[model samples]
Target: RFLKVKNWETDVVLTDTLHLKSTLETGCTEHICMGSIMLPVRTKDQLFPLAKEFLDQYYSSIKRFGSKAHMDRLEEVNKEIESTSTYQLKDTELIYGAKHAWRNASRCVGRIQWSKLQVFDARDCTTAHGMFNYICNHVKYATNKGNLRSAITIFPQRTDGKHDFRVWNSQLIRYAGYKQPDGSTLGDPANVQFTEICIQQGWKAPRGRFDVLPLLLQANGNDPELFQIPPELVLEVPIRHPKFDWFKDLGLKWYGLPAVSNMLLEIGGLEFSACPFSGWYMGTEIGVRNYCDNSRYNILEEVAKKMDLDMRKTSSLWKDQALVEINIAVLYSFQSDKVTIVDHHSATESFIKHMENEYRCRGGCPADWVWIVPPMSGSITPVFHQEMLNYRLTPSFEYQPDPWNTHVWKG
Candidate 1:
């Protein structure tokens, strides 16, 4: 049975301000996402202690399991161990460490095969922590109406490019009809097959549109730590732009978008590649000439529609109307592009500006359609959440629900 709801309110508040101010000041900064090695201090604080403790305890056992060879043989192993933390270990320490152990032990046993080492690593706990922590702090915060009630109210007009599921589902349902138990909606029998058709077409799982590969597999095959591994595979997609000579300088060859997308789709077992127009490929075997095409016309046309350009007249594209999404995937190999993988923000900016200038000259509005790009998702969480400061981090809305209210929660 449920207990009676009580309004046991208390008002014992303190005027302490120094702690609060210091907490915010010390913690708040422009968020940076430097992939595996350059994670924010907040993440490092949460994960490192546990990982260090585990490693310190497990070092002996791991060493014992593998035979003790000469100091020279063990010197390489010792050096790797020393530089483990120095290299800015991946967030997934558990898998990474296990892989490390496998490789070291395999070396003593025989000619250490890197592929076999990757198959045995079990330290995925770090990734689990980082991913889950990100969800709790960012995703939950964005969806939560209680914390920033005023800002939420002011920014009532929802926008895309931020995973606005509410907006997408509402639009889709409105444009595409619904279904009922008897196979037809109460108002329209003609739209009875809406649900069935959507299901059959595999639109229900929206992520199915993109290709996804396991990080472990990629690390095992292409990661540089395994010294004996062959050179990484290269899947080149041909890119052709009339006025842009940037690709040559950047060492990126043009792979046609359609061919690249199709190839990735075939290999990834997906219907299509996500963000095909702007996405770039990484990690392919040497000597294999994987070709694709990405012409400037396709990119320009999409940008034109996003900027609300009128193809007939073509003279109205600008930044105010442009919507875009940008994402970066880190590729690790034993060679040069291994660590310190900085994203090319300037290149992205240049392209955006070019699209704006060119499309504006023509008479296109470029704002009629939507633009979708993924931004850097890894960032820091608030200190209050990390420290579990209940007073500063209390949920604002309780069991309340009202359309007029900006902040409301079911419970």
Candidate 2:
């Protein structure tokens, strides 16, 4: 009778394979094995106990699941490992994280003793490419009429096969800057710009190198967007994107009276897709695409009141610094479910006061870094989802070193 053994180690010995025998048996004499019988006891011993324990305990469990289920589990584990270890991911998530680290390092390059360009792995929801489309569209509309002081660009590492972080280096600009009607330079220096740009270079992980572009914006005299605006106050509210209403799109008119005041009013819910820039962080958990209601707007009004600026004349300028300040405000409104009251107030008041005192003879914020302390906490919140106040807005911020041409991709 043949009995199944739980912990038996199996070995096959071939007489003709003398090299294999000698390698496994005793160390070779005169650099060769000559009909020597040897046993690798440690290898056999390790396998014996493991096999015995597994076979003895899990035989019944394996029988219940059957071979198909067992195989399926094995396949799933293998696939997961292959995906992560291999460069199967496609998008800008890694690129954005790297870019962020590079930006942090660049900022401290001249000022700090030790600067590091840190790297982070993308999470499950993170797409390979960072979200860029909506940002570009919003920016395009905001600066449509004003002189486009700089062109938006992107940084991405290109690769052909599985997920290699290697050869990661690329810096691009869709266009160049042009002269405004007032005959002055566009793009402010106060804006944050990318100091390092990377893309895939070779056939390995983190497969590339990163480079920097000192000056990305240069003046030109042209209008990329043909849409002309009446030369009036360019407010560029930067409110959350409008909701998608089929009726509104169909051009149907609905006549209705305003709701009664204080009737326990519940503002219409703002969809996450409508507001692309905002995110929310409540306690330890954070979620992107938060909802904003009218109450939030009221808070903005209160904050605006504190700034006390003439809405009609106060102009928000985007100097060499990136217009990231505007983007941050949009993001904060989404995150906090409230308007960027502090940022709005500070930006509005600062521009008005700046215009009044300095008169923008050069047509941008005067200094490399202008300190406008909004009533809120920090100059700029590291992450928008978190609720904090008092942030600063750099005028012409770029995520890559090539401020002028770095291609800003869409989501």
Candidate 3:
């Protein structure tokens, strides 16, 4: 039997593709599921099986399968694990795992550029100050003066999971938010809690909209420290409409690089608690999610009023039209300013291409339909109609707990 998809509106079949591949029923009640990480901690004695398995996979990847060098390395790895309860990954392995993790990322729609992601190995860093320097360098290179580049800076691996290096910001560059007198957020509401934590750490809050937050870095399980990011290193794009001259008056701005700073990178069971990855934005990410989400900027009514749409009536489809314009506005500004970005339709098509490429190369591509599909266009987007498996893969990016909670945050 083949997997098939069709448009319910027109009875038009998109494609009858792929063979029926089924595994045990789990995560969902045989139909669907939500996901995360929550991987169990393994002690030094328990790391060998995973480490050995990963080395085997790595060695086989290089056509060195069953070679003396491969066998020797495996023995060495086992010996180290047996003696010390943990082993270190070679630079080549770290590089390989980073790319593999990106390739195996199920929730991301931008895997078409998986091969081009640069890995910055900061495993040698032993202090928060050094982490700040490396992160600044990461931002500078990834920003690339508005021509964004995909890069990841991996901090030290978690040997015991207790003393892991951590970047406390959910993202590397996010606007600080303040709780006003009415308890309303002045900036990004998503970042309000983090902004308070930074303030507690002695960072003077600017008390304005769009103030970029400081970095809260915890090195090797130590208490977190605050460091200000060099503003010159951050490349930002101010939102404006290509046609409407007044759109610039909204004072909307977004950083050029989308850097997720607090995710665990799992490479053959080795966990990197503070591996930060940066990539260029998909225009819809900024336009639909960041700009239009009710809890976010919530700029729909403002734009609708500006467009002279009927904001008082929901049935008038004013919100829809405003969403269209906002989407256009973000893309227009990013394009006009030469900031790297891709529109949702193009990104969706590219994801389809990536799926085909992955299915052929790796037999299966794990994808969460709700995530791969765009926020603005759900049923209309091709990815929405695509039938795909959602499963965890090795060397993947997984969400971990915040450092403040893990080690306790004090005022």
Q: What's the TM for model 2?
A: 0.19
TM-scores of all predicted structures: 0.17, 0.19, 0.92
lDDT of each: 0.22, 0.23, 0.83
User: Using TM-score as the measure, which candidate wins?
Assistant: 3
Error of 3 at 87 (Å): 0.6
Clashing pairs in 3: none
Backbone clash numbers for all candidates listed: 42, 72, 0
* Order of quality (lDDT): 3, 2, 1
By TM-score rank, best first, the candidates go 3, 2, 1
Positional deviation of 180 in candidate 2, in angstroms?
Answer: 9.3
Task: Give the per-residue Cα lDDT of candidate 2 at 116.
Answer: 27
For model 1, the stretches where C-alpha displacement exceeds 4 angstroms are 1-61, 65-411
lDDT of 1 by residue, 76-135 (tens): 434543554222223333333333322222101111121232111122312322322321
Error of 3 at 196 (Å): 0.3
Cα distance off (Å), candidate 1, residue 254 = 5.9
How accurate locally is residue 2 in candidate 3, as Cα lDDT from 0 to 100? 47
Candidate 3 error regions (>4 Å):
1-26, 29-32, 35-41, 408-411
